[PDB]
Amino acid sequence: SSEESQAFQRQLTALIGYDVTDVSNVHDDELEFTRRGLVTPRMAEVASRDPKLYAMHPWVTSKPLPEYLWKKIANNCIFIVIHRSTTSQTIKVSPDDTPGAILQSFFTKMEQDFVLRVCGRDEYLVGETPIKNFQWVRHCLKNGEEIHVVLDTPPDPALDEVRKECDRKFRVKIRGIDIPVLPRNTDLTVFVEANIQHGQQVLCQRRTSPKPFTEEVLWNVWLEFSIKIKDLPKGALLNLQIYCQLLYYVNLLLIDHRFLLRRGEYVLHMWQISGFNADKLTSATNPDKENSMSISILLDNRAEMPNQLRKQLEAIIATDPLNPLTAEDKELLWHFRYESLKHPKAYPKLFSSVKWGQQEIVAKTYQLLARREVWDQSALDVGLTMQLLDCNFSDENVRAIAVQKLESLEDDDVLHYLLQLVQAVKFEPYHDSALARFLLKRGLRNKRIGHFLFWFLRSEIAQSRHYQQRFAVILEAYLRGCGTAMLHDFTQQVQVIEMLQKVTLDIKSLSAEKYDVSSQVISQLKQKLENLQNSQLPESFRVPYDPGLKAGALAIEKCKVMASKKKPLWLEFKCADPTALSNETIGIIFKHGDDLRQDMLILQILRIMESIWETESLDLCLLPYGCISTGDKIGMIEIVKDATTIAKIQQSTVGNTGAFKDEVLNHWLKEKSPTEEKFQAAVERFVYSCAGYCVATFVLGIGDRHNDNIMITETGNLFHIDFGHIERVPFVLTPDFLFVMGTSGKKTSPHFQKFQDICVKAYLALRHHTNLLIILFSMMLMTGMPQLTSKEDIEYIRDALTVGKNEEDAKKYFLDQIEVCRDKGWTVQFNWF
Ligand SMILES: CC(C)c1ccc(-c2nccnc2N2CCN(S(=O)(=O)c3cccc(-c4cnc(N)nc4)c3)CC2)cc1
Numbered sequence: 001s002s003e004e005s006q007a008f009q010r011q012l013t014a015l016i017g018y019d020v021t022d023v024s025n026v027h028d029d030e031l032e033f034t035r036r037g038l039v040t041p042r043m044a045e046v047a048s049r050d051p052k053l054y055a056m057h058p059w060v061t062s063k064p065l066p067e068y069l070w071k072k073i074a075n076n077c078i079f080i081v082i083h084r085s086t087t088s089q090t091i092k093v094s095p096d097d098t099p100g101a102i103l104q105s106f107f108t109k110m111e112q113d114f115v116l117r118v119c120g121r122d123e124y125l126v127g128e129t130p131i132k133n134f135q136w137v138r139h140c141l142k143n144g145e146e147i148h149v150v151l152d153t154p155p156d157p158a159l160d161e162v163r164k165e166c167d168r169k170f171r172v173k174i175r176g177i178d179i180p181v182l183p184r185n186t187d188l189t190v191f192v193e194a195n196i197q198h199g200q201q202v203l204c205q206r207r208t209s210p211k212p213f214t215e216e217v218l219w220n221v222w223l224e225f226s227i228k229i230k231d232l233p234k235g236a237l238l239n240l241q242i243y244c245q246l247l248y249y250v251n252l253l254l255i256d257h258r259f260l261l262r263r264g265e266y267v268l269h270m271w272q273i274s275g276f277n278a279d280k281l282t283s284a285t286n287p288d289k290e291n292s293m294s295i296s297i298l299l300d301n302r303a304e305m306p307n308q309l310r311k312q313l314e315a316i317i318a319t320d321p322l323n324p325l326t327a328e329d330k331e332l333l334w335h336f337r338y339e340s341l342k343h344p345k346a347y348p349k350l351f352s353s354v355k356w357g358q359q360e361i362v363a364k365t366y367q368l369l370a371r372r373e374v375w376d377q378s379a380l381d382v383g384l385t386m387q388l389l390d391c392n393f394s395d396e397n398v399r400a401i402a403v404q405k406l407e408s409l410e411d412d413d414v415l416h417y418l419l420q421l422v423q424a425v426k427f428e429p430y431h432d433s434a435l436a437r438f439l440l441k442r443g444l445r446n447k448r449i450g451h452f453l454f455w456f457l458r459s460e461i462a463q464s465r466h467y468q469q470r471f472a473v474i475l476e477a478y479l480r481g482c483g484t485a486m487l488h489d490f491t492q493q494v495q496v497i498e499m500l501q502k503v504t505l506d507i508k509s510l511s512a513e514k515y516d517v518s519s520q521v522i523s524q525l526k527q528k529l530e531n532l533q534n535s536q537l538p539e540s541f542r543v544p545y546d547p548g549l550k551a552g553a554l555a556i557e558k559c560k561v562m563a564s565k566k567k568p569l570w571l572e573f574k575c576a577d578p579t580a581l582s583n584e585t586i587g588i589i590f591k592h593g594d595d596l597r598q599d600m601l602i603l604q605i606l607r608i609m610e611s612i613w614e615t616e617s618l619d620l621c622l623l624p625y626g627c628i629s630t631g632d633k634i635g636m637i638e639i640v641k642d643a644t645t646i647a648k649i650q651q652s653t654v655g656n657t658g659a660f661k662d663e664v665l666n667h668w669l670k671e672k673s674p675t676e677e678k679f680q681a682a683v684e685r686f687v688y689s690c691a692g693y694c695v696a697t698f699v700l701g702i703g704d705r706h707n708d709n710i711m712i713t714e715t716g717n718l719f720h721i722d723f724g725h726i727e728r729v730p731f732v733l734t735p736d737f738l739f740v741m742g743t744s745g746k747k748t749s750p751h752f753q754k755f756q757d758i759c760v761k762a763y764l765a766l767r768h769h770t771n772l773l774i775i776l777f778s779m780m781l782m783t784g785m786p787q788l789t790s791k792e793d794i795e796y797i798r799d800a801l802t803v804g805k806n807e808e809d810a811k812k813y814f815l816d817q818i819e820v821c822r823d824k825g826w827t828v829q830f831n832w833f
Pocket of ligand 1: 562563564568589591625637638639640641642643644645647648708709721722
């Protein structure tokens with residue numbers, strides 16, 4: 001242990017926002033044992049990285065260029081503009097031309113130590129991929145934009161260097177609970193519920209004699225369980241709960257990370273309920289020992305299948321993931337488990353029908369995971385895989401076969417699911433896990449993933465007492481192998497970020513619920529930023545939410561506090577890249593108040609929906625604006641250029657409490673549209689945007705929004721914001737939207753025909769992916785929400801997706817929705833006062 005070694009680990013602590021060397025809140029080896037464990041994988045991957053692709057992080061895809069998109073090409077001709085000092089020149093290019101082929105089609109057109117960086121960004125067009133298959137190139141086409149690139153020497157790989165390094169029954173004694181203070185009522189009653197638990201499947205359950213709720217309550221009882229030790233499954237949780245009604249909980253893994261039976265004396269500080277979720281599963285103990293409830297415990301311990309059964313079975317397998325299997329359903333799946341293995345789709349339900357509390361049966365389960373041959377051959381199906389990592393499955397080998405499948409994902413896809421897989425670590429019974437390692441693999445393999453992984457992790461470590469230890473050990477594994485380049489970038493980012501959390505907090509306090517932003521408050525802000533620039537704040541930091549963009553110095557004059565309840569900052573920066581084609585500013589918001597994580601989740605689903613729509617050549621021009629959480633109820637938000645609220649547009653001359661008129665929206669588009677044809681573009685863009693956000697929100701159950709939370713770009717692109725948050729209407733199709741389509745109050749139109757038609761395809765498109773959507777929603781709710789319901793709240797989505805139903809009744813159901821919204825018109829909007 002050098003110094004060196006410490007100062008490093010010190011900077012590491014500073015990045016993570018947690019100290020993984022601290023052993024104050026542990027009762028065993030596991031975290032430390034996971035740190036040592038993760039080294040081998042980290043290394044393996046570090047020592048395997050192609051150093052120059054690593055350094056240049058090409059952002060590519062194996063996916064076919066969508067149709068829409070194809071019809072935006074001259075004649076197998078794509079234009080590119082290169083630059084060298086204050087020089088330029090275009091090259092015609094064909095979609096399949098490699099970069100190398102291009103670069104050489106230039107040295108011919110009149111050394112190899114030169115490469116194609118995109119202008120303004122830290123992004124590269126290198127490696128063996130068709131230009132069509134780079135994402136920037138795809139982003140350029142979508143947005144009607146010209147592709148601009150600089151020529152310069154490759155960044156040095158050496159910059160990215162890493163630094164070296166029994167048959168008896170189970171019982172538990174319940175000695176007693178203790179708590180420094182009570183006053184919440186006066187004397188009620190309370191017992192302890194000991195639960196043996198696997199995939200949230202309760203295996204066995206005992207309670208204690210009631211007693212009255214004194215600051216201390218001893219028992220002091222042995223509690224015997226049905227189950228025998230030998231039949232305890234790896235991953236079993238002793239789950240201890242205190243009822244009056246449910247008030248505190250805490251879990252103890254019964255089998256440890258060396259497969260030993262947990263044996264001895266414990267004092268487990270519990271977690272409290274704040275009135276079915278991932279926080280309830282945790283092995284973590286409450287780190288706040290001053291105030292927490294405390295519990296105390298001692299551990300001393302061939303042939304075929306008849307027509308209609310096959311059909312009963314297949315009926316069951318066909319079912320959705322929320323369709324509950326009866327004991328019949330289960331006995332059937334198990335008994336015919338060999339038939340079952342022939343369908344990858346039957347797996348969740350099959351392994352949900354394993355009696356894990358029986359060792360002989362567990363044994364048999366492994367026996368048939370030995371015969372993996374159909375699973376292995378099957379085409380990856382992220383929904384199906386993802387199901388094998390929720391709270392229902394808590395066996396190492398099951399979850400491993402899932403992860404096995406994710407290995408075949410290319411980078412492109414990993415990013416789409418990165419946040420949910422990170423969150424899936426909540427359901428892991430152990431700190432080291434296939435899933436953990438896979439994230440760590442992939443993050444270390446590709447810079448882009450490695451960046452979003454860093455913040456996704458840090459996001460939780462900063463504000464999940466229940467999991468911050470675990471995720472911290474993992475964040476460390478990453479940072480220990482990601483390269484000094486990136487430590488530097490991160491360290492800077494964190495520093496910028498922390499600075500701005502202070503400024504944002506100091507300011508919020510300096511403002512009460514008077515809805516006005518007084519100049520001596522804007523005096524304070526304007527100043528504070530100067531007093532930081534100046535200090536302290538570095539020459540340039542990399543934009544999380546979009547790590548292609550570097551930001552440098554503030555544009556103070558353009559910065560402002562926002563005249564909303566939360567008083568968020570609205571910060572604009574210059575772009576530290578001297579090469580970009582514009583002067584448009586880099587705009588970031590900061591915000592204390594709401595839990596930003598919920599927002600990240602809805603956005604990432606929104607991207608999963610967009611990509612689905614690509615697989616059927618649909619483009620609904622969502623804007624999932626960038627949004628990274630950073631700390632307790634605080635994070636950051638992308639500023640979407642040339643955009644206003646819809647509320648803001650209604651407060652025209654048509655002002656505050658007296659509103660709203662149907663046209664208005666329309667003039668604003670024309671007012672802001674240079675030519676009647678660009679205006680024309682906008683109504684297209686709008687018809688689409690509207691389609692997207694209508695189906696999306698409906699499905700996600702966030703349909704019904706006041707329009708101060710709905711926005712639109714000058715160019716016609718509408719978009720919800722502030723998912724916050726948390727007489728109805730299924731969505732915000734208000735008469736002002738409808739005219740512009742040209743139809744109010746209840747007629748019809750070319751565009752409202754178009755609109756209707758587009759939704760119908762979109763809804764249906766999503767329905768072709770019911771299961772994936774169901775698992776994500778379900779996962780979204782358990783890993784990121786306040787009050788939920790292991791049935792009802794999650795079952796919302798099966799309904800909104802109209803599971804059951806032929807293609808027809810679905811389409812019908814949706815146009816009703818539309819008609820509901822019209823009935824109706826301005827009712828709800830008005831109702832918000
Ligand atoms: C930016 C201006 C046009 C604005 C001002 C106030 C409001 C607003 N009005 C009523 C109620 N709430 C409001 N919010 C302002 C701040 N936001 S936010 O910071 O959490 C947020 C969330 C999502 C998107 C945005 C955003 C991004 N880019 C731009 N250009 N504008 C807004 C801002 C919450 C909602 C919306 C937009």
